[PDB]
Amino acid sequence: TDDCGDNSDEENCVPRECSESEFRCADQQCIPSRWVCDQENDCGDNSDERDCEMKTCHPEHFQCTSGHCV
Amino acid sequence: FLCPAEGTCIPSSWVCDEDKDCSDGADEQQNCA
Amino acid sequence: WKCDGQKDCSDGSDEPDLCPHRFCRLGQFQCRDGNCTSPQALCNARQDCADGSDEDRVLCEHHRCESNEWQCANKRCIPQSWQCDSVNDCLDNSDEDTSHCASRTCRPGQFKCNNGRCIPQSWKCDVDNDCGDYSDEPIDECTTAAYNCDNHTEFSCKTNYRCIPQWAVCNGFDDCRDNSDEQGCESVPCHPSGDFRCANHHCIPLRWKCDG
Amino acid sequence: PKALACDGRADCLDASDESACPTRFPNGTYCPAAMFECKNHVCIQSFWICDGENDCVDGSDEEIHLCFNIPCESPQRFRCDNSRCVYGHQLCNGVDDCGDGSDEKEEHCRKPTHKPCTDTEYKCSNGNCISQHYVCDNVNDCGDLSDETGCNLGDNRTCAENICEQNCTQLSSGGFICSCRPGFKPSTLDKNSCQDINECEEFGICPQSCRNSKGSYECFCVDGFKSMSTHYGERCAADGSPPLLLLPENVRIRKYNTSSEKFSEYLEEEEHIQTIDYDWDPEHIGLSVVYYTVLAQGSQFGAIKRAYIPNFESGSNNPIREVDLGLKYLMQPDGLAVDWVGRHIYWSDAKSQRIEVATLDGRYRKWLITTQLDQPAAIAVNPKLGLMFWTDQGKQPKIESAWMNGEHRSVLVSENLGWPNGLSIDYLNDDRVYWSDSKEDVIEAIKYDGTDRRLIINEAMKPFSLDIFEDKLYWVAKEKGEVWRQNKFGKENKEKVLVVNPWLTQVRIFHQLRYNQSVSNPCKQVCSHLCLLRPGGYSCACPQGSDFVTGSTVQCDAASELPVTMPPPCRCMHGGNCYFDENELPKCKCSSGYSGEYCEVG
Amino acid sequence: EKVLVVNPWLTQVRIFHQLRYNQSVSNPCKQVCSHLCLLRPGGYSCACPQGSDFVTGSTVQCDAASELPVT
Amino acid sequence: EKQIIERMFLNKTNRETIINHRLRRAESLAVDWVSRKLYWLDAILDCLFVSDLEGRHRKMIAQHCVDANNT
Amino acid sequence: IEFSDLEGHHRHTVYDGSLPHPFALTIFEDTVFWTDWNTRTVEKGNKYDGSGRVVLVNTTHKPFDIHVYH
Numbered sequence A: 001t002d003d004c005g006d007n008s009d010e011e012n013c014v015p016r017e018c019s020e021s022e023f024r025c026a027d028q029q030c031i032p033s034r035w036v037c038d039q040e041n042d043c044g045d046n047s048d049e050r051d052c053e054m055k056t057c058h059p060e061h062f063q064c065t066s067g068h069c070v
Numbered sequence B: 001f002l003c004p005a006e007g008t009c010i011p012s013s014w015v016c017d018e019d020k021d022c023s024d025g026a027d028e029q030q031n032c033a
Numbered sequence C: 001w002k003c004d005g006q007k008d009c010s011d012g013s014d015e016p017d018l019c020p021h022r023f024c025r026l027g028q029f030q031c032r033d034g035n036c037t038s039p040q041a042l043c044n045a046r047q048d049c050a051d052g053s054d055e056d057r058v059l060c061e062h063h064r065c066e067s068n069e070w071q072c073a074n075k076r077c078i079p080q081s082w083q084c085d086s087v088n089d090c091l092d093n094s095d096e097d098t099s100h101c102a103s104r105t106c107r108p109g110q111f112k113c114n115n116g117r118c119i120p121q122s123w124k125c126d127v128d129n130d131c132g133d134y135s136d137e138p139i140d141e142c143t144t145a146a147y148n149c150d151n152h153t154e155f156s157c158k159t160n161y162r163c164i165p166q167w168a169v170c171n172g173f174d175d176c177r178d179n180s181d182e183q184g185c186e187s188v189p190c191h192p193s194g195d196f197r198c199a200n201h202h203c204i205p206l207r208w209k210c211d212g
Numbered sequence D: 001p002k003a004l005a006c007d008g009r010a011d012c013l014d015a016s017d018e019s020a021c022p023t024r025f026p027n028g029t030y031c032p033a034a035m036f037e038c039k040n041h042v043c044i045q046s047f048w049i050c051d052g053e054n055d056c057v058d059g060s061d062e063e064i065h066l067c068f069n070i071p072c073e074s075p076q077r078f079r080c081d082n083s084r085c086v087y088g089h090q091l092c093n094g095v096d097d098c099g100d101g102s103d104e105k106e107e108h109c110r111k112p113t114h115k116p117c118t119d120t121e122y123k124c125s126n127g128n129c130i131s132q133h134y135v136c137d138n139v140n141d142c143g144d145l146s147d148e149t150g151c152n153l154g155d156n157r158t159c160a161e162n163i164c165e166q167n168c169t170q171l172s173s174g175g176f177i178c179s180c181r182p183g184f185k186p187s188t189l190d191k192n193s194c195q196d197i198n199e200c201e202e203f204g205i206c207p208q209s210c211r212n213s214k215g216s217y218e219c220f221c222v223d224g225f226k227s228m229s230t231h232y233g234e235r236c237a238a239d240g241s242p243p244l245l246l247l248p249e250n251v252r253i254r255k256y257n258t259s260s261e262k263f264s265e266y267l268e269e270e271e272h273i274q275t276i277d278y279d280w281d282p283e284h285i286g287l288s289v290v291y292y293t294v295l296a297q298g299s300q301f302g303a304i305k306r307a308y309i310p311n312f313e314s315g316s317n318n319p320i321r322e323v324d325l326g327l328k329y330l331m332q333p334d335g336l337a338v339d340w341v342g343r344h345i346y347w348s349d350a351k352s353q354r355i356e357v358a359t360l361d362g363r364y365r366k367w368l369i370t371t372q373l374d375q376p377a378a379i380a381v382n383p384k385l386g387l388m389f390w391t392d393q394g395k396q397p398k399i400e401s402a403w404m405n406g407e408h409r410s411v412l413v414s415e416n417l418g419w420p421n422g423l424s425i426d427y428l429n430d431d432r433v434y435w436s437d438s439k440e441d442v443i444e445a446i447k448y449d450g451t452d453r454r455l456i457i458n459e460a461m462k463p464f465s466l467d468i469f470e471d472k473l474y475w476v477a478k479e480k481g482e483v484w485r486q487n488k489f490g491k492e493n494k495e496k497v498l499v500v501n502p503w504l505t506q507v508r509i510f511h512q513l514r515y516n517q518s519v520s521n522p523c524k525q526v527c528s529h530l531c532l533l534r535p536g537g538y539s540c541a542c543p544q545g546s547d548f549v550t551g552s553t554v555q556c557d558a559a560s561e562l563p564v565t566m567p568p569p570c571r572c573m574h575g576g577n578c579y580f581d582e583n584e585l586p587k588c589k590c591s592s593g594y595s596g597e598y599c600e601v602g
Numbered sequence E: 001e002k003v004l005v006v007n008p009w010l011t012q013v014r015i016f017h018q019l020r021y022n023q024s025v026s027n028p029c030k031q032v033c034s035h036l037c038l039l040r041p042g043g044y045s046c047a048c049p050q051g052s053d054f055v056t057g058s059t060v061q062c063d064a065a066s067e068l069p070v071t
Numbered sequence F: 001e002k003q004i005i006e007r008m009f010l011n012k013t014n015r016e017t018i019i020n021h022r023l024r025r026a027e028s029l030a031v032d033w034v035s036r037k038l039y040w041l042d043a044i045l046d047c048l049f050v051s052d053l054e055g056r057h058r059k060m061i062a063q064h065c066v067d068a069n070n071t
Numbered sequence G: 001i002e003f004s005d006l007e008g009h010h011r012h013t014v015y016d017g018s019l020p021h022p023f024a025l026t027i028f029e030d031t032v033f034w035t036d037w038n039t040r041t042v043e044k045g046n047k048y049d050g051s052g053r054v055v056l057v058n059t060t061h062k063p064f065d066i067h068v069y070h
């Protein structure tokens, strides 16, 4: 986000490393891993909401026939 | 002489004459060894 | 300069009545058959005119050149530093002749190698093998007190006895042959007003900003 | 500068500094007798007369009546048959400098005999005809390290006693100097014995093949190609209908006749098409199937879609109906390849960093390569070799090869590469692979094992894709939006084919010979789900997220899905209009002069 | 409403029809000027080619030489 | 850039070129108001020249080294 | 900037190494004037201690060989 007004902070910028419990969208953005396959477009391009039946999810969830988790 | 790399059957007069007749040259390196 | 458009002499003998047609432009030698060539073509032993008049005996008999050049017995002039370098700058190897390259002396201010090269006096004891015979680098003598760097202006290399001027420090080029002068340029501060700091820690003159 | 006015030389570009001046001499001449006088008062050196250079800006230098009478000499200036003495450098320079192509014809070119040796000369290596006295003087006079061949001293010898194999020369003091007869080279040991050359090995010797023989070679066109000779030389022409180009843009895919030069519409109204590939005439119905990728747009996933293509002549008479394979979760499907033999489709996804395989109907998805891919692009497959090849155009570019089953992955080229965006294989020249760069913008080819790297085309204006067919290599300059062509071995020069759009993302050549149809499927129906290929055989595999049944290697615990059939296509030919009834089956409103259910009867 | 889609090389759309411009508009110029007869509100105005001026304030004749029409 | 030495009056007239030959690389010049002589340095020939203000009678007055040690 | 007796004795620094890149200098009355390459400026100040330093002008091109005409 811009915090200067002339956007000089967000320039010459390399995307940060995602930490242990984050997931990295195709556009190099980091989101909480809980948000993958939760039925919401959290990356903005649905990069989080795919291959969902090819993985399991945290034991407190129920997994849909389509592999999404609630 | 059938050299394995092609499956062709060249005349036996071409064996051990220092000419690489077929691709693998089995008439030189495989027979005259 | 004789027989052209402009009268150069005060007397006017520059342009006599018996003057041939001028076929060439100004400041250019004219061949006897009307061809044109540059003045440097005169008496360089490579015939350039159609008649070879540029190498005529009468013309080249008493040819002389500038103080910064040396003349071979062939009567072709080459820069003074192109003697005794194992390169055939003259045609007849008069520059590289062994009797000459033994007997010759350097012009004032230059050091002589056993090879027969002359070099700048500064080139003596600077690690670089300038003479080819390492005559400019006597290790026993180069490491004595007589060749200490001028501490007002020169920076001393770490791993050898080379001294380089301070303005060569972290300029982005290996000047010490061990990269000593490019170490830790981050600590080097630019002059407060005259320099512009780069993305790297080099300081360049401000006049070089946005020059293209 | 004013000093350059009225001084004989034209110093204005238009010569206007000379074209209006007083007379120079007291008889009205402008120039000395030594110079020529152009009619625009320009002075010019005499020997510049009609040398081909437009010297007088007026053109007075190049009048034919003057040109004919100028003295000339063949090595420096020669008469062209239009009475113009062309400059000798301009013979065979690549340009018709005179208007009949005399200064380009081969007869004054080449060599009549190439200065052949007599008894007074010496052959040296292979024709360096200097005088004979080089014979075994123990000096490398020829320059080529072949001046001394044999050369074993001793006066009382002649090799007619069978000391050397063939074609000696008499040594004055050693009996034999024995250079090899043409088509042979001397062996290291026993140099008197000559080894036959292998002329099939040398790159680009013939359009398709070769047959090494005793001191000679013979080359031929393989099955399906006919021998033809161009003005240059050999061409193996493909039989059947002429090859087509398929041009995918972000909105449509366009067909092109490379023989007729007319476009065809094909698929339209689509959006975000990236790469295509086809499968030639599976059902023998006379219609191939074209597969194409679709990118993710906005917040929506892409697709892989397939549709029929008429092999015959059709346009605006057959509506094109595309279908979706149903591969969800697709984002940047940027490499696509169709395996015609095993009936599998391979693709890469640039977002997901992986290579996937599935059937031609989208069933049984399986991941093949999942690790150490940065941006996988431009996959290709060779069932007749059992290898499939992909490029990576990420931060450390590489070209790799692996078995179709997913094993024996290895790196082919990693040295000196930048954005290898496109990839193609020559099935006739040793399965040699081509790829196109975008940073160094070269096109390069290499053997399939990764040996003999060669830079085939230089300064290719940032190529983006390739196809190789019928001895020529086609590519797309992406920015300029032009399709370009060369002889596939890098010889001769480039040539513009046609210009489309900056939206052009690929060129794919469309012909039955592109992908050899007579390759036999190794699978023997013992494998459920996928039956992948490998060098010399097959391999059974399970879909993603399922394993084999324990103690079995041909059966998996996953279920099976029925094949997904094609909708019936519009098969109308010769401009007959397709039609849909209450049954929604495609039928024909056939044109005049033709009969049949569609238009099949003349 | 979307009409059609083409390459991003498209630079302009222009309607090519007779009624786009009133073809029957009368040319007000009276064959006065030696060179240009430009229009102005309710009439015309003569002008010389670039660099050439009117001779002695004739306001119809310029110092420029007249040039043949190109067909 | 032209490798010439010019002169002109301060009222910006009678501009002329006094030296135009063998001026490989001139660096600095000084005009002698007393003896009406012109002194200038050449960096290529490594010399100090002298001439009258009209640019005639050129003479080399220094070359090579200065100190007794030739340092 | 430094000055000395005409025989080279008794040197005194006016500016102690604070000038970017002087090229030519001239004197009149109490004032040194000099042209500076790095800043492309013409500057003046007291000829003995460098006090009252003032920038006179600053040009696009480098200045060379300033002279006081008097």
Ligand SMILES: *[C@@H]1O[C@H](CO)[C@@H](O[C@@H]2O[C@H](CO)[C@@H](O[C@@H]3O[C@H](CO[C@H]4O[C@H](CO)[C@@H](O)[C@H](O)[C@@H]4O)[C@@H](O)[C@H](O[C@H]4O[C@H](CO)[C@@H](O)[C@H](O)[C@@H]4O)[C@@H]3O)[C@H](O)[C@H]2NC(C)=O)[C@H](O)[C@H]1NC(C)=O
Pocket (backbone or CB within 6 Å): C033, C034, C035, C050, D034, D046, D047
């Ligand atoms: C530098 O510029 C000079 C200019 O002179 C060029 O040198 C030669 O220039 C002459 C110009 O005349 C070229 O042509 C020569 O003309 C001579 C005169 O012709 C006589 O015969 C005719 C017959 O109808 C009469 O009308 C006429 O009045 C004369 O009586 C010929 O005699 C020359 O032929 C002989 O001399 C030349 C060398 O000069 C030989 O090469 C010939 O074999 C022959 O012996 C000739 O026709 C002449 O061609 C120019 N020289 C050359 C070698 O080309 C230079 O060419 C130019 N510089 C360069 C490098 O080109």
Ligand SMILES: *[C@@H]1O[C@H](CO)[C@@H](O[C@@H]2O[C@H](CO)[C@@H](O[C@@H]3O[C@H](CO[C@H]4O[C@H](CO)[C@@H](O)[C@H](O)[C@@H]4O)[C@@H](O)[C@H](O[C@H]4O[C@H](CO)[C@@H](O)[C@H](O)[C@@H]4O)[C@@H]3O)[C@H](O)[C@H]2NC(C)=O)[C@H](O)[C@H]1NC(C)=O
Pocket (backbone or CB within 6 Å): C020, C021, C032, D025, D026, D027, D028, D029, D031, D032, D033, D034
């Ligand atoms: C219009 O007017 C011009 C003159 O204003 C004429 O041009 C002259 O033409 C004559 C006749 O051709 C030229 O004279 C001859 O020149 C030859 C070349 O010599 C050149 O080089 C020498 C040495 O530098 C110069 O002295 C000379 O001027 C030339 O530049 C000579 O070789 C000729 O002499 C030869 O013949 C005589 C016999 O006649 C012998 O005795 C000699 O030994 C020698 O072999 C002769 O001198 C004259 O040079 C031309 N000048 C120019 C400027 O071109 C035009 O011809 C004329 N045109 C018309 C249409 O009338």
Ligand SMILES: *[C@@H]1O[C@H](CO)[C@@H](O[C@@H]2O[C@H](CO)[C@@H](O[C@@H]3O[C@H](CO[C@H]4O[C@H](CO)[C@@H](O)[C@H](O)[C@@H]4O)[C@@H](O)[C@H](O[C@H]4O[C@H](CO)[C@@H](O)[C@H](O)[C@@H]4O)[C@@H]3O)[C@H](O)[C@H]2NC(C)=O)[C@H](O)[C@H]1NC(C)=O
Pocket (backbone or CB within 6 Å): D240, D241, D242, D244, D256, D257, D258, D259, D260, D311, D312, D313, D601, D602
């Ligand atoms: C890309 O562009 C090329 C060139 O335009 C197309 O190829 C042509 O396609 C047409 C249409 O099919 C072909 O026309 C057919 O020609 C047959 C005879 O051809 C032979 O003899 C001629 C003699 O000049 C040769 O030129 C030619 O090479 C062949 O040797 C006719 O027999 C066909 O009509 C007759 O037979 C049919 C049989 O069913 C009857 O139904 C008809 O009533 C009639 O009796 C027909 O006219 C033409 O030959 C092709 N030429 C070439 C150079 O190949 C490609 O098809 C096109 N491809 C695409 C998809 O765009």
Ligand SMILES: *[C@@H]1O[C@H](CO)[C@@H](O[C@@H]2O[C@H](CO)[C@@H](O)[C@H](O[C@@H]3O[C@H](CO)[C@@H](O)[C@H](O)[C@@H]3O)[C@H]2NC(C)=O)[C@H](O)[C@H]1NC(C)=O
Pocket (backbone or CB within 6 Å): E022, E023, E024, E025, E026
């Ligand atoms: C295109 O331009 C033509 C003119 O070339 C227009 O026709 C004329 O338009 C004017 C202005 O609207 C009308 O007055 C004209 O009608 C007649 O004008 C005379 C005066 O000249 C009156 O006395 C008549 O009573 C009558 O009103 C009309 N006719 C002409 C040829 O002068 C035309 O409208 C225009 N059309 C379009 C499609 O824009």
Ligand SMILES: *[C@@H]1O[C@H](CO)[C@@H](O[C@@H]2O[C@H](CO)[C@@H](O[C@@H]3O[C@H](CO)[C@@H](O)[C@H](O)[C@@H]3O)[C@H](O)[C@H]2NC(C)=O)[C@H](O)[C@H]1NC(C)=O
Pocket (backbone or CB within 6 Å): B006, B007, B008, D222, D223, D224, D384, D516, D517, D518, D519, D520
């Ligand atoms: C298209 O692919 C097929 C093979 O996939 C090619 O046909 C094959 O051609 C070769 C060479 O003529 C044949 O090899 C020969 O086999 C016989 C034994 O059958 C052997 O005695 C010979 O020495 C030789 O090895 C091969 O049999 C043949 N395959 C079949 C089944 O026909 C075809 O030529 C390819 N076309 C092109 C243009 O690539």
Ligand SMILES: *[C@@H]1O[C@H](CO)[C@@H](O[C@@H]2O[C@H](CO)[C@@H](O[C@@H]3O[C@H](CO)[C@@H](O)[C@H](O)[C@@H]3O)[C@H](O)[C@H]2NC(C)=O)[C@H](O)[C@H]1NC(C)=O
Pocket (backbone or CB within 6 Å): F010, F011
């Ligand atoms: C550089 O600039 C200075 C200052 O602008 C110029 O000085 C000026 O020189 C002119 C001519 O000598 C002087 O004009 C004279 O003024 C007197 C008094 O008004 C008048 O009686 C004369 O007829 C004449 O017009 C002007 O006063 C003088 N200005 C100053 C401030 O001294 C100088 O000429 C310029 N130098 C060059 C080479 O251009």
Ligand SMILES: *[C@@H]1O[C@H](CO)[C@@H](O[C@@H]2O[C@H](CO)[C@@H](O[C@@H]3O[C@H](CO)[C@@H](O)[C@H](O)[C@@H]3O)[C@H](O)[C@H]2NC(C)=O)[C@H](O)[C@H]1NC(C)=O
Pocket (backbone or CB within 6 Å): F068, F069
């Ligand atoms: C060129 O400059 C050098 C270096 O300044 C001059 O060398 C000087 O030479 C003299 C005589 O050799 C040296 O004096 C010597 O001092 C030692 C004691 O330190 C004594 O044992 C010797 O007998 C002798 O007196 C002097 O030290 C030296 N210069 C310095 C300052 O070290 C040389 O004179 C100059 N030009 C010439 C003639 O080469």
Ligand SMILES: *[C@@H]1O[C@H](CO)[C@@H](O)[C@H](O)[C@H]1NC(C)=O
Pocket (backbone or CB within 6 Å): C148, C149, C150, C151, C152
């Ligand atoms: C080094 O510099 C100091 C000044 O800081 C000076 O007094 C001394 O003489 C210099 N020594 C050398 C080696 O020149």
Ligand SMILES: *[C@@H]1O[C@H](CO)[C@@H](O)[C@H](O)[C@H]1NC(C)=O
Pocket (backbone or CB within 6 Å): D166, D167, D181, D182
């Ligand atoms: C030697 O070579 C020539 C061709 O240069 C050939 O005609 C001749 O038959 C050869 N001689 C022998 C003995 O093979």
Ligand SMILES: *[C@@H]1O[C@H](CO)[C@@H](O)[C@H](O)[C@H]1NC(C)=O
Pocket (backbone or CB within 6 Å): G055, G056, G057, G058
């Ligand atoms: C020098 O440039 C500055 C802008 O950085 C400007 O304010 C100043 O007026 C200039 N100097 C003069 C007095 O010309």
Ligand SMILES: *[C@H]1O[C@H](CO)[C@H](O)[C@H](O)[C@H]1NC(C)=O
Pocket (backbone or CB within 6 Å): A055, A056, A057, A058
């Ligand atoms: C299923 O996926 C979840 C994702 O949170 C965990 O990685 C879990 O351990 C997985 N379980 C299996 C058996 O793969």
Ligand SMILES: *[C@H]1O[C@H](CO)[C@H](O)[C@H](O)[C@H]1NC(C)=O
Pocket (backbone or CB within 6 Å): C104, C105, C106, C107, C108
């Ligand atoms: C070399 O130096 C000697 C003195 O030692 C002479 O001055 C001679 O003229 C010099 N020669 C050259 C070529 O400079």
Ligand SMILES: *[C@H]1O[C@H](CO)[C@H](O)[C@H](O)[C@H]1NC(C)=O
Pocket (backbone or CB within 6 Å): D022, D023, D024, D025, D026, D027, D028, D029
């Ligand atoms: C051309 O100029 C020359 C100069 O000598 C003569 O005056 C000559 O008479 C002029 N005109 C003609 C027509 O020759």
Ligand SMILES: [Ca+2]
Pocket (backbone or CB within 6 Å): A035, A036, A037, A038, A039, A040, A041, A042, A043, A048, A049
């Ligand atoms: Ca989500």
Ligand SMILES: [Ca+2]
Pocket (backbone or CB within 6 Å): B014, B015, B016, B017, B018, B019, B020, B021, B027, B028
């Ligand atoms: Ca053999």
Ligand SMILES: [Ca+2]
Pocket (backbone or CB within 6 Å): C001, C002, C003, C004, C005, C006, C007, C008, C014
């Ligand atoms: Ca002169």
